Each structure stands twice: as structure tokens, then as C-alpha cells.
Amino acid sequence: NPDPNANPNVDPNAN
Amino acid sequence: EVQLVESGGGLVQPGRSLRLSCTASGFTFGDYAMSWVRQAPGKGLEWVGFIRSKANGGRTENPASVKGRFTISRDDSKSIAYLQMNSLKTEDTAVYYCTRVELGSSWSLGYWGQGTLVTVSSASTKGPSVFPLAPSGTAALGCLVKDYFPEPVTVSWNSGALTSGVHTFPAVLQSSGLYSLSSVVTVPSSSLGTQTYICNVNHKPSNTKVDKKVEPK
Amino acid sequence: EIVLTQSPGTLSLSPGERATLSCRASQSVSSTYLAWYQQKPGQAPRLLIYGASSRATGIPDRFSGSGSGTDFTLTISRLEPEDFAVYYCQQYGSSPWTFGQGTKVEIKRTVAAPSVFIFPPSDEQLKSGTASVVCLLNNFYPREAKVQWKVDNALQSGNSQESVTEQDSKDSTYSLSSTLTLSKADYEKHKVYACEVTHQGLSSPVTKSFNRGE
Amino acid sequence: XVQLXXSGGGXVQXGXSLXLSCXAXXXXXXXXXXXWXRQXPGXXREXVXXXXXXXXXXXXXDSXXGRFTXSXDXXXXXXXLQXXXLXXXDXAXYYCXXXXXXXXXXXXXXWGXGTXVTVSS
């Protein structure tokens, strides 16, 4: 369960 | 070649604001996340935020230490990334690096700019006082460059003719907000009575040029 | 927040040796979200290795990495002279992004005890109402040292600042200055001013002192 | 309190080898650096070598670089000094000392009684 806020290459907002 | 140039840094009083710019070149700017990293003088690296590419929402992420104070934006038209800094305090004094976030599964900081210095201080420009560190076989003598602002000062001995055994220490920031440093040099005890030693201190921000003679006592 | 603790603080090696830098995390992080950077004095950091087994472009083969979960390692198989610098590990799989405190890889040499010199304040500065006493530790190795000011045998606290040079490019030694700053009035109510220096190359502490007005 | 006991000294001809031991009692010394000093007659105690904590390395004086080797055995609470290519100017009483500062500033508070090393033909 990677942290979405840490990810800068993928949109955190769900579809 | 990937290029990142920081600009907009310098001296700023506490409480004021300052916006840093990062002009990119050599790659497709709009496709990459950008991130800011700062380094306090003499300390390590601290991440102060990133901004995603607009194809991934274009939103930002900030640490708690600067949250509500720092704002990151981007202008894909001119390939410039901005760091808006509000309510600057002295702890924000650091060299600020602009970095490009690498694409893919492992988003490391692949490219760095040379960095720009931001100094948050309320001190006013002041020229240094140059006092001799008089020598009493090897004897040590030197010069004390005390209470100046801003940085830096250049120190040479005998107009640059004396370089061996010279140690000019890094400046320290006193509680008063001014800087101080020492420049020492070791010489044979016999040369004290004959050879003369003069330290040359230069402080261009205050037009201070002092040629101090250090003699034994 | 995930804290990256690097060990040791300073690695004292020589060209040709193997360098093993450790980086431990307070929480389990995936290797894909861990990177290593190199920074030389006065220059921007540069990326070396990241992820499970990725190397930055143009990075020599002597740099390698490994580790799983909580303990990671950056290895330099055979150290080159250009490899002496500071190395930071970074995690970016958890917000906020964090760096380690940094590991310095320095040139190892033989032990050299500091030569200690003390300088009383000049008469020019005393005429202005402030006295600066300077203690100099010249050309010592290794870096670790202790400087303590004693005024009439009383240990001082909170009225001195230290400054240390970079490792000298010729003899690989350090030099350190400690400045004791006082008002002229406080300076003139005491006789003996001394700095006590401790170092692993000294069997006993070295004290340099002077009597005010001599 | 801590007690240090040197051993392994003796008489050797020029070029010979000796292995000194320094056994520590009263405290586990794994967290502390251990140093060797020597004192020749009429001279001051001079630094020989230091073995910091395991992984933090060993450091040596110029006079013994390339001839002496210091090492540790934390399981036995003991440090060793391997002395090769001995010369008569290495004749001294050899002491070990604990650096009580884990940060390696050289706070030598506890010393051993010393062991005599004599190099002569």
C-alpha cells in the first residue's frame, strides 16, 4: 500500500 | 543536455516574502515533476516540496516545516518552476536546489541545479574590525576579522606572497547577526624579528580594505 | 515520518579500499523508493543509484547498492580519489520525503596531535570594550577533539564558538579555532585564561594559558 | 571500576615480533576505543595506536605505521597490539587506555600498569 502523497508521477485523485 | 538554473535568491528581512525561479532547458518540461530541496549552511538536505506534471493533476506536496508558508507552482509556457516563500524566518536561510523528478517506478532526483542562496536576516551592512593575533621553533600568528555583514571577506597575507601554512577558518554567525572569522599562519620563530607579516582583509559590501601589521609582543 | 539514520558519521579510508555505507530506516521501505546521492563541498548533490538496482547515467561500476526492508548499503568496491565526499541516502516512498544526515568519506592518514596556541585579545579591541580570546588547534588528525575554556580554573559554557577547516589537500589534517568572547569588564575581573584540549593522540589534556596583563 | 592489564612484553632481538594483550575487567569495553601508549626512559608517554569500535577502524602513529597492527576481540573484552619489525628505539613500557568518550575525543581516564618491551641483541 504505497503512499499516494509520496508518489509524484501518479495522480492521487481517484477517477 | 538537461539544465536547471535557479534565480531570485539573496538577502531578505524576516517576515518578508521572496519568490525563487527555476528555468529548465534540454528536456520536455511539462512531462516532469519538479521538486525543491534546500540545504542549511553546514547541514544536510531537506525536501521542501514537489509539484506533479499537469498530466498528473499538477498538485503539490509540502512538508510540515514549511506547510502554509511555502507554495510551489509551475509555468509550462516558459518552462519555469516557482517557489513562493512567505513569512521567511532565519531558519529558512539555506541554499535552495531545483531538481527534476525522474519518470517511472522509482522517482529519484535525477538532475540538480547549481542552487541559489537565500539569507533571512535583519542585520545591516557593517564593515569588519581587524585585530592582530600576535605571536609570542614554530610560532603562530594571525588576524581576527570580527563583526561584519554580509558575507564574504577575503584574507591574504603579504599581498598573496605568503600562502604556505595559512589557514583561513570559515566564518561563524554570532548571536548578534554578524559574522566573524580568523586567519592564522605558522612561521619559523627566527623570522619574527626580521620578516614582516601583514594580513590583507577585503570587505567589498562595505568598501573596507585594511592592511594590518602583526608584530610580536 | 520515516527517519533515515546513516552510519558511521565519518568513514576514514584510503584510495584502493572498500567503502560500505549503511542507511537504516525507522520504518520498512521498499528498495524501489530508496536512492543515494553524492555531494562534494561547494557543489550540488548528484544522484548515484536508486531503486532496486538502478544506476544513474554515467556512474562508474564501483558504486553498487543492496538491502531490503530496513537496512540498506551503498558499496564502493575500490575507492578512487574523486570518491571522497559526502553521501546521503533518501527515501521517497513515504510522505514526507526524507534524507539521511549524511556520511562523510575522508582520507585516512596517521595520527597527528594538535599544536595548541592561545592568543589574548589585542589592546586595540580592548579599547572598544570587548575581549576575544582565541584558541588554535593546528594540523591535527583525526577530526575528533575537545576544547574547553577555563577562566581562573572555572569551566566556561555558552560564550565560545568553534570553527573547523576542511581536510587539508596536502597533509590531510584539520585545524580548529575556538573563540571565547567577553565584555572588557568581565574580562578584567579574572587572571588566568586557558583552553584545555583533548585528543586521542594525547596521553593527557594539553593546556595553553596566559595571565591577563603579561 | 574498570581495570586494565597488559601482558605479552619481553625481550626480543632487532627484527623480531611481539604480541601485546590488554585485558579489561570491571566494564564491557565494546562501546569504547582502546589506545596503546609507550614511554621510553626519560621521555614522555607517546601515542602508538588506537582501535576504535568495530567498524570505526584503527589509527596509528607515524613511528609505527606499517609495522604495528592493533585489533580487538570484544567477546574476550581484550585488545591486542601486534608488533613487527621491532627496532631498539621501540624499547619502552607499553600502556593501554580506554577512551571514556564514545565520541572519540580521547578522554583517557583509565590506564593499565604497563608491560616492558626490550629490543636488543
Tab-separated table of N, CA, C and O in Angstrom, chain B residues 35 37 39 43-47 49-50 61-64 97 101-102 105-115 130-135 138-142 144 146 163-175 182 184 186 212 217, chain C residues 31-35 37 39 42-47 50-52 57 88 90 92-93 95-101 117-122 124-125 128 130 132 134 136-139 161-166 168 170 173 175-177 179 181 214:
chain	number	residue	atom	x	y	z
B	35	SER	N	10.851	19.314	-8.083
B	35	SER	CA	10.934	19.274	-6.632
B	35	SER	C	12.019	20.223	-6.146
B	35	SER	O	13.050	20.406	-6.799
B	37	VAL	N	14.664	21.231	-3.031
B	37	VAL	CA	15.425	20.746	-1.888
B	37	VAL	C	16.323	21.879	-1.416
B	37	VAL	O	16.931	22.577	-2.235
B	39	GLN	N	19.342	23.260	1.632
B	39	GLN	CA	20.443	22.800	2.473
B	39	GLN	C	20.915	23.963	3.334
B	39	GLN	O	21.539	24.900	2.827
B	43	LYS	N	24.747	21.871	7.109
B	43	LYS	CA	23.847	20.777	7.456
B	43	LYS	C	23.491	19.978	6.199
B	43	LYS	O	24.075	20.165	5.126
B	44	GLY	N	22.529	19.069	6.347
B	44	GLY	CA	22.161	18.142	5.300
B	44	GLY	C	21.071	18.660	4.386
B	44	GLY	O	20.760	19.853	4.351
B	45	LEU	N	20.488	17.738	3.631
B	45	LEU	CA	19.462	18.057	2.650
B	45	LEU	C	18.075	17.867	3.251
B	45	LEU	O	17.823	16.890	3.964
B	46	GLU	N	17.175	18.804	2.954
B	46	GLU	CA	15.793	18.745	3.412
B	46	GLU	C	14.870	18.955	2.222
B	46	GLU	O	15.005	19.946	1.496
B	47	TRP	N	13.947	18.021	2.017
B	47	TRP	CA	12.959	18.158	0.957
B	47	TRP	C	11.888	19.157	1.377
B	47	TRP	O	11.286	19.018	2.447
B	49	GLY	N	9.345	20.187	-0.906
B	49	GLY	CA	8.166	20.103	-1.745
B	49	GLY	C	8.400	19.703	-3.188
B	49	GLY	O	9.493	19.898	-3.729
B	50	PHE	N	7.370	19.137	-3.819
B	50	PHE	CA	7.400	18.832	-5.241
B	50	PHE	C	6.085	19.272	-5.870
B	50	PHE	O	5.121	19.610	-5.179
B	61	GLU	N	2.856	18.929	-2.930
B	61	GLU	CA	3.015	18.279	-1.636
B	61	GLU	C	4.129	18.991	-0.886
B	61	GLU	O	5.193	19.243	-1.456
B	62	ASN	N	3.882	19.325	0.377
B	62	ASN	CA	4.829	20.087	1.172
B	62	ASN	C	5.020	19.444	2.535
B	62	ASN	O	4.090	18.839	3.079
B	63	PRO	N	6.213	19.554	3.110
B	63	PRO	CA	6.429	19.067	4.474
B	63	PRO	C	5.827	20.011	5.505
B	63	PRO	O	5.500	21.164	5.223
B	64	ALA	N	5.699	19.496	6.730
B	64	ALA	CA	5.041	20.259	7.785
B	64	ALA	C	5.845	21.489	8.188
B	64	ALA	O	5.264	22.483	8.640
B	97	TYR	N	17.903	24.228	-3.925
B	97	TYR	CA	18.162	23.497	-5.156
B	97	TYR	C	16.856	23.194	-5.873
B	97	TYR	O	15.862	22.812	-5.251
B	101	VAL	N	12.310	15.501	-11.105
B	101	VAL	CA	11.939	14.168	-10.644
B	101	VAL	C	11.937	13.216	-11.831
B	101	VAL	O	11.336	13.505	-12.871
B	102	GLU	N	12.609	12.079	-11.679
B	102	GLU	CA	12.698	11.110	-12.763
B	102	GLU	C	11.375	10.379	-12.953
B	102	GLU	O	10.672	10.067	-11.988
B	105	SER	N	8.888	4.055	-12.205
B	105	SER	CA	8.524	3.453	-10.926
B	105	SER	C	9.342	4.014	-9.769
B	105	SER	O	8.844	4.078	-8.639
B	106	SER	N	10.591	4.401	-10.014
B	106	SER	CA	11.486	4.889	-8.965
B	106	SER	C	11.786	6.359	-9.241
B	106	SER	O	12.666	6.683	-10.044
B	107	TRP	N	11.070	7.246	-8.551
B	107	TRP	CA	11.141	8.683	-8.824
B	107	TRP	C	12.221	9.323	-7.955
B	107	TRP	O	11.960	9.954	-6.930
B	108	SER	N	13.463	9.156	-8.389
B	108	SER	CA	14.594	9.804	-7.748
B	108	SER	C	14.802	11.199	-8.331
B	108	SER	O	14.216	11.572	-9.350
B	109	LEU	N	15.654	11.977	-7.669
B	109	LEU	CA	16.023	13.311	-8.142
B	109	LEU	C	17.209	13.160	-9.088
B	109	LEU	O	18.361	13.077	-8.654
B	110	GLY	N	16.922	13.119	-10.392
B	110	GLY	CA	17.958	12.806	-11.360
B	110	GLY	C	18.869	13.961	-11.711
B	110	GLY	O	20.056	13.750	-11.979
B	111	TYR	N	18.347	15.187	-11.718
B	111	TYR	CA	19.128	16.352	-12.110
B	111	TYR	C	18.920	17.487	-11.121
B	111	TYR	O	17.802	17.720	-10.649
B	112	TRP	N	20.004	18.191	-10.817
B	112	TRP	CA	20.011	19.270	-9.842
B	112	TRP	C	20.538	20.548	-10.478
B	112	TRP	O	21.416	20.516	-11.347
B	113	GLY	N	19.988	21.679	-10.042
B	113	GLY	CA	20.573	22.961	-10.362
B	113	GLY	C	21.734	23.292	-9.442
B	113	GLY	O	21.959	22.650	-8.418
B	114	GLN	N	22.491	24.323	-9.824
B	114	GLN	CA	23.632	24.732	-9.016
B	114	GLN	C	23.211	25.343	-7.687
B	114	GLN	O	24.038	25.439	-6.774
B	115	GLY	N	21.954	25.741	-7.556
B	115	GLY	CA	21.433	26.256	-6.299
B	115	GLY	C	21.579	27.760	-6.185
B	115	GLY	O	22.487	28.376	-6.742
B	130	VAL	N	39.571	44.514	12.229
B	130	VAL	CA	40.678	43.590	12.020
B	130	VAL	C	41.647	43.755	13.181
B	130	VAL	O	42.289	44.803	13.324
B	131	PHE	N	41.759	42.717	14.011
B	131	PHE	CA	42.658	42.757	15.150
B	131	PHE	C	43.772	41.732	14.992
B	131	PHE	O	43.538	40.636	14.469
B	132	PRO	N	44.985	42.052	15.430
B	132	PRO	CA	46.100	41.118	15.249
B	132	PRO	C	46.098	40.017	16.297
B	132	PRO	O	45.843	40.252	17.481
B	133	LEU	N	46.390	38.801	15.841
B	133	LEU	CA	46.668	37.665	16.719
B	133	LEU	C	48.189	37.570	16.807
B	133	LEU	O	48.837	36.882	16.018
B	134	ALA	N	48.755	38.288	17.770
B	134	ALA	CA	50.197	38.479	17.811
B	134	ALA	C	50.905	37.196	18.239
B	134	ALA	O	50.431	36.489	19.134
B	135	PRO	N	52.033	36.867	17.617
B	135	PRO	CA	52.820	35.713	18.056
B	135	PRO	C	53.601	36.012	19.327
B	135	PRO	O	53.923	37.162	19.635
B	138	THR	N	58.433	26.946	16.075
B	138	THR	CA	57.385	27.413	15.177
B	138	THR	C	56.416	28.302	15.943
B	138	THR	O	55.881	27.895	16.979
B	139	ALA	N	56.192	29.507	15.429
B	139	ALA	CA	55.283	30.467	16.036
B	139	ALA	C	54.054	30.652	15.158
B	139	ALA	O	54.150	30.649	13.927
B	140	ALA	N	52.902	30.815	15.799
B	140	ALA	CA	51.634	31.028	15.116
B	140	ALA	C	51.194	32.474	15.301
B	140	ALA	O	51.263	33.012	16.411
B	141	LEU	N	50.765	33.101	14.208
B	141	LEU	CA	50.223	34.451	14.235
B	141	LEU	C	49.016	34.501	13.310
B	141	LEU	O	48.794	33.597	12.500
B	142	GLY	N	48.220	35.554	13.436
B	142	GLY	CA	47.038	35.629	12.607
B	142	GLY	C	46.300	36.940	12.751
B	142	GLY	O	46.772	37.880	13.394
B	144	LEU	N	42.153	38.544	13.250
B	144	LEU	CA	40.771	38.311	13.647
B	144	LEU	C	39.885	39.325	12.939
B	144	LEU	O	40.018	40.532	13.163
B	146	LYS	N	36.312	40.532	12.767
B	146	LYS	CA	35.173	40.419	13.669
B	146	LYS	C	34.073	41.408	13.296
B	146	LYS	O	34.350	42.545	12.901
B	163	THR	N	51.424	31.969	1.239
B	163	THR	CA	50.319	31.026	1.158
B	163	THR	C	50.548	29.735	1.929
B	163	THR	O	49.567	29.088	2.313
B	164	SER	N	51.797	29.345	2.168
B	164	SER	CA	52.072	28.106	2.880
B	164	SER	C	51.782	28.260	4.368
B	164	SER	O	52.098	29.286	4.978
B	165	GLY	N	51.176	27.229	4.952
B	165	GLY	CA	50.833	27.253	6.360
B	165	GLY	C	49.726	28.208	6.740
B	165	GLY	O	49.551	28.484	7.930
B	166	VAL	N	48.970	28.717	5.773
B	166	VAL	CA	47.887	29.654	6.042
B	166	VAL	C	46.586	28.878	6.188
B	166	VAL	O	46.270	28.010	5.366
B	167	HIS	N	45.840	29.180	7.249
B	167	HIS	CA	44.522	28.598	7.482
B	167	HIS	C	43.549	29.737	7.751
B	167	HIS	O	43.608	30.372	8.809
B	168	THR	N	42.672	30.010	6.790
B	168	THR	CA	41.576	30.955	6.971
B	168	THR	C	40.330	30.150	7.320
B	168	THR	O	39.805	29.411	6.480
B	169	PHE	N	39.866	30.284	8.558
B	169	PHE	CA	38.755	29.474	9.024
B	169	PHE	C	37.439	29.962	8.420
B	169	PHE	O	37.302	31.142	8.082
B	170	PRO	N	36.461	29.069	8.264
B	170	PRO	CA	35.133	29.504	7.814
B	170	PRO	C	34.502	30.455	8.817
B	170	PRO	O	34.711	30.347	10.027
B	171	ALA	N	33.721	31.397	8.299
B	171	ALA	CA	33.059	32.365	9.160
B	171	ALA	C	32.012	31.680	10.033
B	171	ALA	O	31.456	30.638	9.677
B	172	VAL	N	31.755	32.275	11.195
B	172	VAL	CA	30.692	31.826	12.082
B	172	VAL	C	29.710	32.973	12.267
B	172	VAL	O	30.079	34.150	12.198
B	173	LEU	N	28.449	32.622	12.502
B	173	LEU	CA	27.380	33.600	12.675
B	173	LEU	C	27.124	33.777	14.167
B	173	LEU	O	26.616	32.868	14.833
B	174	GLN	N	27.485	34.944	14.692
B	174	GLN	CA	27.311	35.226	16.105
B	174	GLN	C	25.840	35.491	16.419
B	174	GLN	O	25.010	35.704	15.529
B	175	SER	N	25.521	35.486	17.715
B	175	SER	CA	24.148	35.735	18.138
B	175	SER	C	23.687	37.145	17.787
B	175	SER	O	22.478	37.401	17.748
B	182	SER	N	38.723	33.921	11.553
B	182	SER	CA	40.132	34.099	11.847
B	182	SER	C	40.950	33.549	10.692
B	182	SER	O	40.533	32.614	10.001
B	184	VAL	N	44.949	32.341	10.288
B	184	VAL	CA	46.187	32.091	11.009
B	184	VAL	C	47.231	31.568	10.037
B	184	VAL	O	46.922	31.107	8.934
B	186	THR	N	51.394	29.680	10.372
B	186	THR	CA	52.537	29.245	11.160
B	186	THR	C	53.824	29.591	10.426
B	186	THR	O	53.932	29.401	9.211
B	212	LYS	N	46.718	45.062	7.952
B	212	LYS	CA	47.090	45.020	9.360
B	212	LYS	C	48.454	44.367	9.533
B	212	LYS	O	48.698	43.275	9.011
B	217	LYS	N	54.889	40.444	20.690
B	217	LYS	CA	54.844	41.217	21.927
B	217	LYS	C	55.075	40.324	23.143
B	217	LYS	O	55.901	40.632	24.005
C	31	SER	N	12.872	-1.144	-1.624
C	31	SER	CA	14.126	-0.750	-2.256
C	31	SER	C	13.892	0.142	-3.467
C	31	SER	O	14.748	0.968	-3.805
C	32	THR	N	12.740	0.000	-4.126
C	32	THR	CA	12.429	0.830	-5.283
C	32	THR	C	12.333	2.306	-4.922
C	32	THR	O	12.515	3.163	-5.794
C	33	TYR	N	12.080	2.626	-3.654
C	33	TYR	CA	11.888	4.004	-3.227
C	33	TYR	C	13.059	4.525	-2.396
C	33	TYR	O	12.882	5.410	-1.556
C	34	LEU	N	14.258	3.994	-2.627
C	34	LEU	CA	15.455	4.420	-1.911
C	34	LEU	C	16.533	4.818	-2.908
C	34	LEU	O	16.789	4.086	-3.870
C	35	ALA	N	17.176	5.960	-2.667
C	35	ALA	CA	18.198	6.484	-3.564
C	35	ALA	C	19.396	6.974	-2.759
C	35	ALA	O	19.284	7.300	-1.576
C	37	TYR	N	22.840	9.704	-2.980
C	37	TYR	CA	23.375	10.891	-3.631
C	37	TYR	C	24.787	11.166	-3.136
C	37	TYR	O	25.155	10.793	-2.018
C	39	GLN	N	27.654	14.356	-2.699
C	39	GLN	CA	27.878	15.797	-2.687
C	39	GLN	C	29.304	16.068	-2.238
C	39	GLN	O	29.706	15.653	-1.146
C	42	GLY	N	30.850	22.563	-1.813
C	42	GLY	CA	30.591	23.664	-2.716
C	42	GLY	C	29.891	23.299	-4.003
C	42	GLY	O	29.742	24.163	-4.874
C	43	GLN	N	29.448	22.053	-4.153
C	43	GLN	CA	28.800	21.597	-5.371
C	43	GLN	C	27.442	20.991	-5.047
C	43	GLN	O	27.189	20.531	-3.932
C	44	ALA	N	26.568	20.999	-6.049
C	44	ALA	CA	25.246	20.421	-5.897
C	44	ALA	C	25.344	18.901	-5.773
C	44	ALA	O	26.254	18.282	-6.332
C	45	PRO	N	24.429	18.276	-5.033
C	45	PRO	CA	24.411	16.810	-4.981
C	45	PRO	C	24.124	16.226	-6.356
C	45	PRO	O	23.486	16.859	-7.200
C	46	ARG	N	24.615	15.009	-6.583
C	46	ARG	CA	24.305	14.281	-7.804
C	46	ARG	C	23.851	12.875	-7.443
C	46	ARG	O	24.304	12.287	-6.457
C	47	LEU	N	22.922	12.356	-8.236
C	47	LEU	CA	22.369	11.034	-7.996
C	47	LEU	C	23.367	9.961	-8.409
C	47	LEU	O	24.046	10.086	-9.430
C	50	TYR	N	19.576	4.332	-7.500
C	50	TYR	CA	18.230	4.416	-6.954
C	50	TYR	C	17.497	3.114	-7.233
C	50	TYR	O	17.957	2.267	-8.001
C	51	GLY	N	16.353	2.956	-6.574
C	51	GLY	CA	15.510	1.812	-6.834
C	51	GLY	C	16.153	0.493	-6.430
C	51	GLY	O	17.116	0.436	-5.658
C	52	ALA	N	15.591	-0.585	-6.980
C	52	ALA	CA	16.073	-1.923	-6.653
C	52	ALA	C	17.515	-2.112	-7.107
C	52	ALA	O	18.373	-2.539	-6.326
C	57	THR	N	22.864	7.566	-14.942
C	57	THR	CA	23.664	7.523	-16.158
C	57	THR	C	25.038	8.132	-15.910
C	57	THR	O	25.162	9.191	-15.288
C	88	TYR	N	24.440	10.955	0.878
C	88	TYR	CA	23.140	10.991	1.536
C	88	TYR	C	22.255	9.899	0.957
C	88	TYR	O	22.176	9.748	-0.267
C	90	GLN	N	18.236	8.639	0.616
C	90	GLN	CA	16.936	9.290	0.566
C	90	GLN	C	15.860	8.242	0.344
C	90	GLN	O	16.039	7.317	-0.454
C	92	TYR	N	11.718	8.013	-0.738
C	92	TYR	CA	10.634	8.799	-1.312
C	92	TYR	C	9.371	7.965	-1.508
C	92	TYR	O	8.485	8.368	-2.269
C	93	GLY	N	9.273	6.814	-0.845
C	93	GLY	CA	8.075	6.006	-0.839
C	93	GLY	C	7.110	6.317	0.277
C	93	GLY	O	6.068	5.663	0.393
C	95	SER	N	5.473	9.853	2.518
C	95	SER	CA	5.455	11.297	2.714
C	95	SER	C	5.585	11.617	4.196
C	95	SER	O	4.895	11.001	5.018
C	96	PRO	N	6.443	12.573	4.582
C	96	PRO	CA	7.257	13.388	3.674
C	96	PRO	C	8.547	12.711	3.220
C	96	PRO	O	9.036	11.806	3.898
C	97	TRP	N	9.083	13.147	2.081
C	97	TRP	CA	10.396	12.683	1.655
C	97	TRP	C	11.448	13.108	2.672
C	97	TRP	O	11.410	14.223	3.199
C	98	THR	N	12.393	12.211	2.948
C	98	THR	CA	13.422	12.472	3.943
C	98	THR	C	14.781	12.022	3.426
C	98	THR	O	14.887	11.067	2.650
C	99	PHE	N	15.817	12.726	3.868
C	99	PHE	CA	17.203	12.372	3.605
C	99	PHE	C	17.871	11.920	4.896
C	99	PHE	O	17.441	12.265	6.000
C	100	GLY	N	18.937	11.142	4.749
C	100	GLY	CA	19.787	10.851	5.882
C	100	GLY	C	20.641	12.048	6.250
C	100	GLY	O	20.769	13.017	5.501
C	101	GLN	N	21.259	11.969	7.431
C	101	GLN	CA	22.094	13.072	7.893
C	101	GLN	C	23.428	13.145	7.162
C	101	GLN	O	24.162	14.122	7.345
C	117	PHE	N	47.809	26.793	20.391
C	117	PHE	CA	48.255	28.159	20.619
C	117	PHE	C	47.089	28.976	21.153
C	117	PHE	O	45.949	28.804	20.710
C	118	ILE	N	47.372	29.864	22.102
C	118	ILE	CA	46.365	30.751	22.668
C	118	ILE	C	46.784	32.190	22.396
C	118	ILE	O	47.975	32.519	22.420
C	119	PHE	N	45.800	33.039	22.111
C	119	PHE	CA	46.045	34.437	21.777
C	119	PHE	C	45.187	35.297	22.693
C	119	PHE	O	43.944	35.186	22.656
C	120	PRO	N	45.781	36.141	23.527
C	120	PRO	CA	44.994	37.105	24.294
C	120	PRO	C	44.419	38.167	23.375
C	120	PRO	O	44.904	38.350	22.249
C	121	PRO	N	43.384	38.882	23.811
C	121	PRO	CA	42.839	39.956	22.977
C	121	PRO	C	43.842	41.084	22.809
C	121	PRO	O	44.645	41.373	23.699
C	122	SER	N	43.791	41.720	21.642
C	122	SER	CA	44.688	42.828	21.362
C	122	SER	C	44.254	44.070	22.135
C	122	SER	O	43.097	44.212	22.540
C	124	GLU	N	43.919	46.936	20.905
C	124	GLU	CA	43.004	47.723	20.085
C	124	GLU	C	41.558	47.319	20.331
C	124	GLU	O	40.675	48.180	20.417
C	125	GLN	N	41.296	46.016	20.449
C	125	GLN	CA	39.930	45.566	20.694
C	125	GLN	C	39.503	45.864	22.125
C	125	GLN	O	38.338	46.196	22.373
C	128	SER	N	37.805	49.083	22.879
C	128	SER	CA	36.423	49.200	22.442
C	128	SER	C	35.433	48.539	23.390
C	128	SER	O	34.224	48.693	23.196
C	130	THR	N	35.347	45.040	24.375
C	130	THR	CA	35.098	43.615	24.206
C	130	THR	C	36.430	42.891	24.078
C	130	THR	O	37.375	43.418	23.484
C	132	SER	N	38.204	39.238	22.892
C	132	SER	CA	38.106	37.963	22.188
C	132	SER	C	39.388	37.179	22.431
C	132	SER	O	40.473	37.627	22.046
C	134	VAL	N	41.351	33.647	21.605
C	134	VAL	CA	41.344	32.664	20.529
C	134	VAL	C	42.257	31.505	20.902
C	134	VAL	O	43.420	31.713	21.269
C	136	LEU	N	43.792	27.995	19.235
C	136	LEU	CA	44.037	27.422	17.920
C	136	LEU	C	44.573	26.005	18.069
C	136	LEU	O	45.565	25.780	18.770
C	137	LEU	N	43.908	25.057	17.409
C	137	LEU	CA	44.361	23.674	17.300
C	137	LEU	C	44.758	23.459	15.848
C	137	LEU	O	43.891	23.395	14.972
C	138	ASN	N	46.058	23.341	15.592
C	138	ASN	CA	46.584	23.357	14.233
C	138	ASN	C	47.027	21.963	13.799
C	138	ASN	O	47.733	21.270	14.541
C	139	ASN	N	46.594	21.560	12.604
C	139	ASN	CA	47.110	20.389	11.886
C	139	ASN	C	47.042	19.119	12.740
C	139	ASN	O	48.054	18.521	13.098
C	161	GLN	N	32.602	29.984	20.450
C	161	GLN	CA	32.202	29.382	19.187
C	161	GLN	C	33.415	28.760	18.513
C	161	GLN	O	34.532	29.277	18.604
C	162	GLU	N	33.180	27.648	17.825
C	162	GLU	CA	34.236	26.900	17.163
C	162	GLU	C	34.070	26.972	15.652
C	162	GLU	O	32.956	27.079	15.134
C	163	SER	N	35.200	26.915	14.953
C	163	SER	CA	35.233	26.840	13.502
C	163	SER	C	36.338	25.876	13.101
C	163	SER	O	37.419	25.883	13.695
C	164	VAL	N	36.061	25.037	12.106
C	164	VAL	CA	36.989	23.994	11.688
C	164	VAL	C	37.137	24.037	10.174
C	164	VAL	O	36.149	24.182	9.445
C	165	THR	N	38.375	23.924	9.703
C	165	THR	CA	38.653	23.928	8.277
C	165	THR	C	38.280	22.586	7.656
C	165	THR	O	38.017	21.596	8.345
C	166	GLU	N	38.252	22.562	6.328
C	166	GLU	CA	38.135	21.300	5.622
C	166	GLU	C	39.454	20.539	5.711
C	166	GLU	O	40.499	21.089	6.073
C	168	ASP	N	42.813	19.294	4.906
C	168	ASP	CA	43.826	19.927	4.073
C	168	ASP	C	44.183	19.040	2.885
C	168	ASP	O	44.336	17.824	3.019
C	170	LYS	N	46.877	18.776	1.241
C	170	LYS	CA	48.266	18.337	1.184
C	170	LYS	C	48.611	17.319	2.260
C	170	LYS	O	49.115	16.237	1.944
C	173	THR	N	45.127	17.086	7.178
C	173	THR	CA	44.857	17.414	8.569
C	173	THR	C	43.772	18.478	8.664
C	173	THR	O	43.428	19.145	7.685
C	175	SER	N	42.280	21.867	11.086
C	175	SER	CA	42.618	22.923	12.026
C	175	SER	C	41.327	23.495	12.589
C	175	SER	O	40.310	23.571	11.895
C	176	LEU	N	41.374	23.885	13.862
C	176	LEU	CA	40.182	24.303	14.585
C	176	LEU	C	40.498	25.518	15.442
C	176	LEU	O	41.514	25.541	16.146
C	177	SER	N	39.626	26.518	15.383
C	177	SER	CA	39.733	27.714	16.204
C	177	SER	C	38.525	27.796	17.123
C	177	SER	O	37.391	27.557	16.697
C	179	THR	N	36.878	30.579	19.823
C	179	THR	CA	36.936	31.972	20.243
C	179	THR	C	36.054	32.166	21.467
C	179	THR	O	34.850	31.899	21.416
C	181	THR	N	34.468	34.938	23.745
C	181	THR	CA	34.118	36.350	23.643
C	181	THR	C	33.499	36.836	24.948
C	181	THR	O	32.562	36.219	25.467
C	214	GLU	N	50.198	40.319	30.870
C	214	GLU	CA	51.560	39.798	30.752
C	214	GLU	C	51.957	39.630	29.286
C	214	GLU	O	52.372	40.587	28.631
